Assembly symmetry: D2
Amino acid sequence: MKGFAMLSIGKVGWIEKEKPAPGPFDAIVRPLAVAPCTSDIHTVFEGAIGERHNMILGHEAVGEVVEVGSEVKDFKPGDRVVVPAITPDWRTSEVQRGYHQHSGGMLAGWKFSNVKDGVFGEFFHVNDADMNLAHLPKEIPLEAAVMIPDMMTTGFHGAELADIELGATVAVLGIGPVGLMAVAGAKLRGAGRIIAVGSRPVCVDAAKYYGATDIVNYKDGPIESQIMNLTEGKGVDAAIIAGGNADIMATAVKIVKPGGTIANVNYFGEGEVLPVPRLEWGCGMAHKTIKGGLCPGGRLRMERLIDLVFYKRVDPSKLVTHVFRGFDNIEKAFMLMKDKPKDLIKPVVILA
Amino acid sequence: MKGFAMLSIGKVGWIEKEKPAPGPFDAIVRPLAVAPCTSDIHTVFEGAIGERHNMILGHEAVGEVVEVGSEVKDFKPGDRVVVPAITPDWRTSEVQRGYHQHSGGMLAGWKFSNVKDGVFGEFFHVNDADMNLAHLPKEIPLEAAVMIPDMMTTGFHGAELADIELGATVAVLGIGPVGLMAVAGAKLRGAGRIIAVGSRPVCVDAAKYYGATDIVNYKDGPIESQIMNLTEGKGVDAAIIAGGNADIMATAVKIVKPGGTIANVNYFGEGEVLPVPRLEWGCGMAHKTIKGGLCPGGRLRMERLIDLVFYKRVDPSKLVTHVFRGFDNIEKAFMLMKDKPKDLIKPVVILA
Amino acid sequence: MKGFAMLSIGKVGWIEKEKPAPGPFDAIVRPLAVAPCTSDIHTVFEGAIGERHNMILGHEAVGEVVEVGSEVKDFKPGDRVVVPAITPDWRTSEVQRGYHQHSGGMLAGWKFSNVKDGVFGEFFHVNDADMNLAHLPKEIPLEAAVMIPDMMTTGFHGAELADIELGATVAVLGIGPVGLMAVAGAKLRGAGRIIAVGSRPVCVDAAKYYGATDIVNYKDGPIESQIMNLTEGKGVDAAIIAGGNADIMATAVKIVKPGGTIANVNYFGEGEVLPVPRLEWGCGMAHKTIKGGLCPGGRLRMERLIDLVFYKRVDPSKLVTHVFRGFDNIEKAFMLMKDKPKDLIKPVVILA
Amino acid sequence: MKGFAMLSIGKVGWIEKEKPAPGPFDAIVRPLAVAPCTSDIHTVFEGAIGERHNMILGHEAVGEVVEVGSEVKDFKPGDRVVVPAITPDWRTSEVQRGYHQHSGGMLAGWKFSNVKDGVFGEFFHVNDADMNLAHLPKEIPLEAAVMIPDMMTTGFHGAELADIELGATVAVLGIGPVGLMAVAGAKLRGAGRIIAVGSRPVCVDAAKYYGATDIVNYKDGPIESQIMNLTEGKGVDAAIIAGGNADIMATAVKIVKPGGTIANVNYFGEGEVLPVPRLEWGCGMAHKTIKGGLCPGGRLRMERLIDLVFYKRVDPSKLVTHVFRGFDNIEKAFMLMKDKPKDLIKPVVILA
Ligand SMILES: NC(=O)c1ccc[n+]([C@@H]2O[C@H](COP(=O)([O-])OP(=O)(O)OC[C@H]3OC(n4cnc5c(N)ncnc54)[C@H](OP(=O)(O)O)[C@@H]3O)[C@@H](O)[C@H]2O)c1
Ligand SMILES: NC(=O)c1ccc[n+]([C@@H]2O[C@H](COP(=O)([O-])OP(=O)(O)OC[C@H]3OC(n4cnc5c(N)ncnc54)[C@H](OP(=O)(O)O)[C@@H]3O)[C@@H](O)[C@H]2O)c1
Ligand SMILES: NC(=O)c1ccc[n+]([C@@H]2O[C@H](COP(=O)([O-])OP(=O)(O)OC[C@H]3OC(n4cnc5c(N)ncnc54)[C@H](OP(=O)(O)O)[C@@H]3O)[C@@H](O)[C@H]2O)c1
Ligand SMILES: NC(=O)c1ccc[n+]([C@@H]2O[C@H](COP(=O)([O-])OP(=O)(O)OC[C@H]3OC(n4cnc5c(N)ncnc54)[C@H](OP(=O)(O)O)[C@@H]3O)[C@@H](O)[C@H]2O)c1
Ligand SMILES: [Zn+2]
Ligand SMILES: [Zn+2]
Ligand SMILES: [Zn+2]
Ligand SMILES: [Zn+2]
């Protein structure tokens, strides 16, 4: 079996491996459409998560079931499914507590391109098929559906953690593919005014399409200064961090009104500590709640997000700015994701 | 001062009263646009709430501040404002608990056309101006803005009580002006599939416009039977009761899946007890939560709802099917609301 | 294998069956101490749940693991464990939603003496051992530990559903073994004043021991009248229904203040509908939330409840008023539970 | 009027001022018993909150009403009341949002010894009497009741923010008078195992009395190392920060399991930023919620806490290790609070 993998930190390349076999509750799937993400770049080049050797990358894909284990009773070979980036082991204490994202350990729900071979291979392994797979309605376009496994589930999760109330004003820091989904998410939770912080024009247009009522560009001056000005010193009800450096945390605390919420969905790869401004946090008593969590996964999560797209509540296709054809282009899409060209949001590779 | 009032149960008419004066924290407002409601029909003809004598009716209006008390520091004469139907006394224990709707007692937050003169008069009294008034942006049309005081706040409240999750399937029982707002509310909370139950064609079109994906008509058979069929025996995640008789409660419990929520915003005027099916409620342990509450009010509530309309998140104008001009037409709009013509949703009377 | 079972509705007796075998994830346990519940009386004599034939009864027990399946990695033969009355199948959509009590259907989490042979036999089957079993510390007495499987978990669940705030006044309707645990539960959630409603002296003393500050006896007059008097017309913040007829629902709604919660843990076996007073429910808008649900189960639930007993936070032994020795006494304890003698709370049978 | 005040940062002394007068909704109260707090030390010597001039200190006291404004309808002169340290203005947007602690601005609910003269004077001013005062039952001892205005409300608030579930294991970092209340608070929310971190023997005994099952002393080694050892690498479900330096934040994040909560009630006076460990916070996705807030206040809050003490749910007297008699001793108690003698927890000054 052939697959695009991480040879060692800093080095990527194509490798040769054996086709995986399914257990009684597992399934083997082949990619119909895949997509790269900033996560793999952080892990490969920055070595954010230790060091791996010959580990296939990628964690966003849709495809068809090739073979299933003897116990899989909801999926048969041939079926087209949406595979969540987070495929947890449903039989742990963490699941009983309510946190499947950390089933087995901190961030353990995230297996692909972490502690398991990713989707950038002729085939990939999915554990607990009946629990971690969802049927993809033939009415949904491949390029759009491939945005569900991660970009959508993460962005929407930011809006969910933000405790948005009807009419509340929300600020989204960072408008990359995830940030853009966070904007659409805020609108889906009832937000009134939505302020997006970014720079690249491509992201700006997408932001407006998704619901952004105001765009703040970090160039015309400091973020906190501009937002405070825009809200007449009142600040925002909630802030969603979808990108930026460690210092973006300070900015977030500085713009949320007392009693507001700061919801983070950004993966911080550098720094030792994230700074929380003492004064702006009311010396520890401003009632400004800080949250941050891995995106949900599983069958149910996917089924619900599929319903939103199906019933035309959201249209993720606007995120796909580049489409490639062929297994070989996986390498191209990956590299393109590294040296971020000013007109790129999210590239997709159609395999069949 | 002249005003339309309830003489005694069953008898309505125009009366003559003295113009009210404001206290240091109060304000006197004159109606720019008003609108009748079924609530007043229930109270006048059915005597649902005891008996009143020469009490001016109505609780839905927008207008301008005529005079304010010595302490009112946020509103001056001439200012155009949106008046909430619920104007509570903000200094009570209930407010400290978090329920301003019952500030001073059960349903005490509702003063107009209950324990205080309504809006159907040349002038009306508003208590705690800085706490119960909101500036109306000149960009919002009068007929649309008059939908914010009651219809919108109540409908949206049903969706809030329903604990809707992204992608969840919601059922709205009753599609009158309030039901239609409940539909729009569910869409704003992230609902996927929304089923609306009604009959009159006018409401049906409005329902679809607001987000209804399926329409169920109580004529083609029993509601519960149809919905269960439509959802393949799975049922709905949440149900919002926006109309119907006492028996509609039984229907609601029958269609929600275990662990679901039943949110009521309907004002039951007849019956002694509302029936909760023992078997369908899992003999008391199906985890089906039942809620029901008076719509929120106050300045903050109105300001947030205004933002939704201002930023084009919702367009309430589609509820107004009849517009009249002149103080004298208040009586006409009222009568029209009683003998519900098949083409009526919500009538509005523009005074100036 | 011998066991006490339900032959047909109305007829009980000892039967002969084959010893069950465990699947790869299951376990076979033998009873060390058991106890009967009111539940089995309702099912056998009243036929509350259809009709069964030769089904072994009982859903409360502690014992040792006889044999385990090939996959069970946390429990070995010889180990002493606490078996929850609710043993759900952890791989269902309901579990992903968060309601393991209805895993597979409404009330599906409850298998023993329902859709599976109970504990009143030389051996019984436990599904998903690593997920539904908890090690019993040798410091906890058998008679006390046998109160954890149902009574404690159910009573405490009533307090959890009640949304009790620090200092809130709670009313517990019905002080049987479950009601008494509800009293102890309220105290553990921070309740201040706790009013218990009952009659039998034995339960009264137990109630006081567990935290009841006031005792209301339905004989000195109507419940609602007495409680309202005691609270100076203010009512209670929350009410937990732990017993009574269908009409107890009406009483509950009548005594809770607007915005309060009504939490039910009582199993209603008779009646067609449970009445919800229209006027007292504020005509559908008093904000009085009504809840009712099957007690939690599983390993985590039991482990946490064990910690409470271990660290002397609760002492369930006071519920055990009768202890018997020997397998043959199971029949006696059962009959005693039917013709409720005035001095009985909960009988226990020690087998070894 | 005489009173103990802050002359300038670093300098304290007795001053002479005019007796304050009440507004129509205010009241003037004289101290019956008062107590010093760490807060005043931070403000006076460290200048944590700008610079004040001749501002009377303290904000923890019980006393009797001397005179009331014309509108005060619940309190008359002579009545003994408990005065909350937090006395907010109940008519602000923040109150409508639900955060009275920040009514008027960040930390604006805290007036005494901040932006208003404290309680260390012959008389002091209380705004909104009917909203910010509670009748003190004559059965409660003065020294115990003086612990309610702030020590109790803050400690309990830590347990409330921690989202404690029945049986959960909680860690309390810092066992000063506030930490000790947080311990008692955790027990009141249903905690099973409670680990307290401290050193001074006096605090240790009090900790055990209040519910601490394990005591960790920062001397036998690093906190995180010891706790992780004690929990067998599992960690704690929640952590309450009741004392320590800025680095205690890092420690808190390091000991809570993924999905747990970190509740802070400690007032950080030094440092620029509070460090949040990137790796231990799962790079921003460990689902570890961080909260921090000013203690609640108002009449309702006090009434409920009074009920807990009245019904013997808690006994705060154990916090009072030093009692003084006479207005002159206020200076002594204050100084004693500065140079913390190893046998001090909380000193009280009885005035009459
Ligand atoms: N583990 C998972 O499954 C998972 C899932 C979703 C997301 N994540 C993580 O969350 C982050 C999401 O990134 P993405 O995929 O949406 O793409 P991205 O292009 O990295 O998005 C970054 C966004 O924030 C920006 N930004 C950079 N510096 C900023 C600053 N100083 N202030 C404010 N904004 C700034 C960008 O602006 P311009 O581009 O306009 O310059 C852009 O809008 C990544 O770190 C990703 O690893 C992880
Ligand atoms: N106190 C307040 O401030 C307040 C605020 C909002 C609402 N409310 C109350 O809540 C209710 C809202 O009514 P509304 O103003 O929206 O107007 P409405 O016209 O009374 O709405 C009733 C809706 O439910 C219907 N319906 C009648 N029988 C039904 C049945 N048997 N099964 C299912 N649906 C049935 C109608 O169908 P067709 O019309 O299609 O026949 C209609 O769609 C009223 O009782 C009102 O008093 C009170
Ligand atoms: N499925 C499960 O796993 C499960 C678990 C727990 C509980 N449950 C159910 O919940 C209920 C719990 O009962 P229990 O085991 O605690 O024993 P119980 O003895 O049946 O408890 C009944 C309590 O309520 C009483 N009561 C009777 N009529 C009343 C009335 N009219 N008004 C107020 N109180 C009245 C009793 O008073 P006196 O005894 O003082 O007369 C007693 O205190 C049962 O129906 C049980 O089946 C089911
Ligand atoms: N604004 C308000 O109304 C308000 C209300 C309540 C509390 N607060 C604030 O919250 C804090 C509460 O302090 P307090 O009154 O309870 O008295 P405290 O004596 O300052 O309490 C400090 C506790 O944490 C300790 N500690 C010191 N260094 C530590 C370290 N490195 N690691 C772990 N623990 C350490 C102490 O241990 P030993 O004493 O055993 O050495 C003591 O147990 C204060 O900063 C106070 O200003 C403010
Ligand atoms: Zn990704
Ligand atoms: Zn109305
Ligand atoms: Zn039972
Ligand atoms: Zn203090």
